[PDB]
Amino acid sequence: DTEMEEVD
Amino acid sequence: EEWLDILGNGLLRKKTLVPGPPGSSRPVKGQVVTVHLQTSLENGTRVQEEPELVFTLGDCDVIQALDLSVPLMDVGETAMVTADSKYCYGPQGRSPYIPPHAALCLEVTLKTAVDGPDLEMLTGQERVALANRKRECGNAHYQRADFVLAANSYDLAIKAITSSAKVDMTFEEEAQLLQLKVKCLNNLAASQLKLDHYRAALRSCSLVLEHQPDNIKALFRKGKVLAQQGEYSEAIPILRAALKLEPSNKTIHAELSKLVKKHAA
């Protein structure tokens, strides 16, 4: 569900 | 009049189309410059037209080509700049599409140049707006896989938040800026981890977890860093703590499985 590698 | 070979290698060339007014001067490092940019590929295909692109000179907010060529322009000048991909969107390209290794023709019109803000004298509202702008820059650099530039924008975003020792902000502003700092530090950790800067990524990860101990991204990134360093004994409870928050997450499973299998030497 949470995309690691994505930036906030 | 003639082409100026800025770096002495024919990779970044500038030709003045329209000169600036007789009294015009060049912008200096730190100034907030506003330009009108018309970007096109080597074959003539137009990418986008930003009529009022605003960026801080020497901060690498957009592309290296702009920070290297704009200090050679007078306020009010229109210049044509041919730049190699290495000073632009590099071996990967970008979101408003740029092909890998594509050389760009930038038609720049430097409009204004005002002195850079005194970070120490910024209001809470201005501090939020500047930090968010640098965060958005870092994010754009990260998507392209320019982790050196992404880390720099996140580093500048943090420096803007933390230089508040001489201004009185409200509690609501302090809290809002704390939420922004954690997002920037996690983003910095994501960037450092990609550059194998393990000791730095760990610091950023640990600072995020001091504010938000149940941050799944910071837990996974701390675990992945500790695993890549060979600290398997410290990595497994942290990677498990992150799986406890999202048990169905395939990426955390794949990371744990890889770590436990390698833990057989």
Numbering used by the authors:
A (entry chain A): 702 to 709
B (entry chain F): 91 to 355
Quote the passages of the study that discuss this structure, keeping the authors' original sentences.
Crystals of FKBP92-380 in complex with yHsp90 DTEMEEVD peptide were obtained by mixing FKBP92-380 with yHsp90546-709 in a 1:1 molar ratio at 18 mg ml-1 and crystalizing by using the sitting drop vapour diffusion technique. The bound peptides found were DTEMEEVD, ATEMEEVD (where the side chain of the first aspartate residue was modeled as an alanine), EMEEVD and EMEE. Superimposition of FKBP92-380 with FKBP52 shows that the TPR domains are essentially the same consisting of three pairs of anti-parallel helices and a C-terminal α-7 helix. In contrast, a comparison with the MEEVD binding TPR domain of CHIP shows that the conformation of the Hsp90 peptide in both FKBP92-380 and CHIP is almost identical, and therefore similar to those also seen in AIP and Tah1. Because these structures share a common peptide polarity, and the hydrophobic methionine and the valine residues of the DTEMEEVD peptide are buried, as expected, in hydrophobic pockets, it is highly likely that this conformation represents the physiologically bound state for Hsp90 peptide. The structure of the FKBP92-380-Hsp90 peptide shows that the C-terminal carboxylate group and the C-terminal aspartate side-chain of the Hsp90 peptide are involved in a series of hydrogen bonds that is reminiscent of the carboxylate clamp seen in the MEEVD-HOP complex. The C-terminal carboxylic acid makes direct hydrogen bonds to the amine nitrogen of Asn 229 and Asn 277 and a salt bridge interaction to one of the amine nitrogen atoms of Arg 225, as well as water mediated interactions to the amine group of Lys 273. The aspartate group of the peptide makes a salt bridge interaction with the amine group of Lys 307 and a series of water mediated interactions with the amide groups of Asn 305, Asn 276 and Arg 311. Finally, the methionine side chain is bound in a hydrophobic pocket lined by Ile 306, Lys 307, Phe 310, Thr 341, Ile 342 and Asn 339.
FKBP8 consists of an N-terminal glutamate rich region and a PPIase domain that is connected by a loop to a tetratricopeptide domain (TPR). FKBP8 belongs to the FK506 family of binding proteins, but unlike many members of this family it lacks a constitutive PPIase activity, which instead relies on regulatory control. Activated FKBP8 has been shown to bind Bcl-2 and block its interaction with the pro-apoptotic protein, Bad, an activity which is inhibited by the molecular chaperone Hsp90. Here we have determined the structure of FKBP92-380, and shown that this TPR domain is specific for Hsp90 binding over Hsp70.
